[PDB]
Amino acid sequence: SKGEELFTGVVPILVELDGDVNGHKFSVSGEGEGDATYGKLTLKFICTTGKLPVPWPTLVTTFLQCFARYPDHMKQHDFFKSAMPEGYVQERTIFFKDDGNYKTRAEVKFEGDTLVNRIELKGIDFKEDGNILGHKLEYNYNSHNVYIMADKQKNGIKVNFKIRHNIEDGSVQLADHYQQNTPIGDGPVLLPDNHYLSFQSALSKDPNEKRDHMVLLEFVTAAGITLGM
Structure with a gap:
């Protein structure tokens, strides 16, 4: 598979985001690598415009589902790799x-041999002293x-999930995510049966980094489709 083949090894990644939340404008640059064979991404993010005006964890899902590890019997349901190298557009509304x-x-x-995630983010109607x-x-x-399903009407997929952000007082801030992806190129892409990606993530800091930043590790494996009865 052409697309699939581009992810057999370790692939360098770049991430660029330009954001505006309630009029607070900011930019973040990110870099690292992904290894689809193990379903593993490792990234570091720096806010290039000063202090990040929202909490880092709220941007985790925004800052690479193409690095999911798909079991063999599920590999023909991997829309993300099938769209490469031309790539795909990923769009979301996230309701806190x-x-x-x-x-x-x-x-x-893919830009050359690097997989690039370029993002625009706009946020509105946040409470001045909300979470x-x-x-x-x-x-x-x-x-x-x-959770992923085909969106045939758009030759892409529709994706949904609900993030739990832990709050310092033991409560939880929910963030309801609605997502769609469509290929950038005209080539055939794979439209999947219903299935999901299992994510786990861990955030940390670079002790030598002067700037506001986030180190992020993700492990992603596809599931939800069975081999046999």
């Missing part, structure tokens, strides 16, 4: 329960399942 929303548009494609603008979120992440 009882708070504002993020809307994102991103292009994920997001008030920075009340713990610096950590939980595991979640990301």
Whole structure:
């Protein structure tokens, strides 16, 4: 498989995001690598414009589903790799329960031998001292399942999941994610049976880094389709 073949080894990654949340504008640059064979991504992010005006964990899902590890019997349900190298557009609305929303548009494609995630993010109607603008979120992440189905009407997929952000007082801030992906190229892509991606993530810091930043590790494996009865 052409697409699949581009992910057999370790692949360098670059991430660029330009954001505006409630009028606070910022930019983040990220870099690292992904290894689809093991379903593993390792990335470091730096806010190039100063202090990040929202908590790092709220941007984790925005900052590479093409690095999921698909079991063999599921490999023909991997839309993400099938769209490469031309790439795909990933769009979302994320509703923070009882708070504002993020809307994102991103292009994920190969630029030379590097896989590049380029993002625009706009956020509105956040409360000045809610969990997001008030920075009340713990610096950590939980595991979640990301549900995928075909969207034939658009030659792409529709994706949904619900993120739990732990809050420093023992409560949880929910973030309801709605996502669609469509290929950038005209070539045939694989449209999948219903299935999900199992995510686990861990956030940490670079002790030598002067800038506001995030080190992120993700492990992603596809599941939900069985071999046999």
